[PDB]
Design a protein around this ligand. Structure first.
Ligand SMILES: CC(C)(Sc1nc2ncccc2n1Cc1ccc(Br)c2ccccc12)C(=O)O
Length: 517
């Protein structure tokens, strides 16, 4: 509400703490849902089905016993990198390759056949996975990144429909509905019997996740007093950062693709159930002509906060008088027609959108394929969650005692350079590769939290909202475009990482030009 009314009710009190505690918790499950792909879409080694081994009759027919390692060569051509071909099989068994003396160069997939009878996967680490369930390998390999992109697409559409809708019906209504939709779609996706159904439900989940993300931030921002807004926003950001540790702790327990999704998405039913006693912001209520309900909510909060007499003395006349400032000037959002037209301000917008897209792209493109970065996914997830926090706390101190522009440029350049260096080092040293990847992700996180603050300060007060929205849309579009880059991995796994490392470096170098503060 207006500063006078909010101060009369109380800037900080019980209700603020209760609402913050209620709203931060779902944010950890809004990060578990986003990062569930690393564990529910893993790619295990997939040999080609062979009747000699799986069908026990044929194997037992041969007198004596033949070791599986020695009997595998006779029916699998030697694939690249001294391994078994992932999507080929011998047309007929070749006992000539059985003798180790003969060179295996003559034995190749020139006279082989495709995987007609299906693939055999590994159940040592993951008991089940979507890839092993719908054969998303070989010719369907490209279908794995696609599922990651569509989900991100949903998020982009959500902010396009949760923007105006929440400005007409309210904040709490949209938040509750989005919680319900998240819970229902997550519960339903676990039972999807075909790939397109799962993709559709994932897209709907992304839509609801965007709605929750916007509404939860708007509701927190409005109610908290002016002096304590960034302090609560950073807590809201730290919740999402602890979401990574939560994800790492959950996946280690259940090894499945349906149980994991169901367990992750079930708590949103409780989130919806208890989300009915949260108060609707009176700021939105009063401006939109809803006076009586806003007054009732204000009195309710005043009674909650421990000041009864103050709330009792309130009357609609004082309420109308105190909010005349907002009513007189009905600030209408200004379109881009008055933003890009001024030549002087063009560079600022260009560079800001460049930074927002660079981070939206590289961080989603790198985090989603967490396997290629290190050795074991669980340790990488835990370390990302642990390291994100200190970087996010230290960025604020850096900004206080150092310029915004140097900090932004240095963080972005260092993140990009660490990501790039991760590829060059060999695979013998898993520890160093994992450490470099973790540092790169932490740097990207720091750059993102710094640019969030930096963007608003650049432009005047009137044009800040349009620029922030443009940056968010750019940053979302880059996220969508991120996963698609992996389709170049056929040439080699190094090219996607090279691109992910080159983009942030150039963005950070460019971001040194725009003025300070
Ligand atoms: C809105 C938020 C979760 S903020 C936040 N802080 C972050 N820090 C690091 C990484 C993500 C972080 N988010 C969430 C986030 C930001 C930008 C993009 Br694009 C996202 C795309 C998909 C899902 C979440 C996204 C909150 O605090 O309520």
């Amino acid at each position: 509400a207006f500063s006078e009314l909010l101060d009369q009710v109380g800037g900080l009190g019980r209700f603020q703490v209760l609402q913050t505690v209620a709203l931060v918790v779902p944010i950890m499950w809004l990060c578990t849902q986003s990062m569930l792909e690393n564990f529910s879409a893993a790619v295990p080694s997939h040999r080609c089905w062979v009747p000699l081994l799986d069908n026990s009759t044929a194997q037992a027919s041969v007198p004596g016993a033949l070791g599986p390692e020695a009997l595998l060569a006779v029916s699998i051509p030697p694939g690249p990198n001294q391994g078994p071909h992932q999507c080929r099989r011998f047309r007929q068994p070749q006992w000539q390759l059985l003798d180790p003396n003969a060179t295996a160069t003559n034995w190749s997939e020139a006279a082989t056949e495709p995987c007609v009878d299906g693939w055999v996967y590994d159940r040592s680490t993951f008991t089940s996975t979507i890839v092993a369930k719908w054969d998303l390998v070989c010719d369907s390999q490209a279908l794995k990144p696609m599922a990651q992109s569509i989900y991100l697409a949903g998020i982009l559409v959500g902010a396009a429909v949760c923007g105006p809708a929440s400005d007409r019906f309210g904040r709490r209504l949209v938040l509750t509905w989005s919680y319900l939709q998240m819970a229902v779609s997550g519960t339903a996706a676990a039972f999807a019997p075909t790939f397109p159904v799962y993709c559709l439900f994932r897209f709907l989940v992304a839509f609801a996740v965007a709605g929750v993300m916007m509404n939860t931030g708007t509701l927190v921002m409005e109610w908290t007093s002016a002096q304590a807004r960034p302090l609560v926003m950073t807590l809201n950001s730290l919740g999402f950062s602890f979401g990574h540790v939560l994800m790492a702790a959950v996946a280690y327990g259940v090894r499945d693709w349906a149980l994991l999704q169901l367990v992750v998405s079930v708590p949103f039913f409780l989130c919806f159930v208890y989300s009915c006693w949260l108060a609707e912001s009176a700021r939105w209520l009063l401006i939109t002509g809803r006076l009586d309900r806003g007054l009732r909510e204000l009195q309710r909060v005043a009674a909650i906060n421990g000041k009864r007499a103050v709330g009792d003395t309130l009357t609609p006349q004082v309420l109308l008088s105190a909010m005349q400032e907002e009513l007189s000037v009905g600030q209408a959002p200004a379109s881009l027609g008055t933003l890009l037209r001024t030549p002087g301000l063009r560079l600022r917008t260009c560079i800001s959108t460049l930074c927002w897209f660079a981070f939206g792209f590289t961080f989603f493109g790198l985090a989603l394929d967490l396997q290629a970065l290190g050795s074991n996914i669980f340790l990488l997830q835990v370390l990302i969650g642990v390291v994100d926090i200190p970087a996010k706390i230290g960025t604020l101190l850096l900004l206080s005692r150092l310029g915004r522009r140097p900090t932004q440029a240095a963080s972005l350049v260092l993140a990009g350079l660490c990501i790039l260096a991760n590829t060059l080092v060999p695979h013998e040293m898993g520890a160093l590769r994992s450490a470099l990847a973790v540092l790169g992700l932490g740097g990207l996180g720091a750059a993102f939290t710094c640019i969030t603050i930096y963007s608003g300060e650049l432009f005047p007060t009137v044009l800040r909202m349009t620029a922030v929205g443009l940056g968010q849309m750019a940053a979302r579009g880059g996220a969508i475009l991120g996963p698609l880059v992996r389709l170049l991995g056929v040439h080699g796994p190094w090219l996607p990482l090279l691109v992910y490392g080159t983009v942030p470096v150039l963005s950070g170098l460019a971001a040194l030009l725009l003025p300070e503060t």
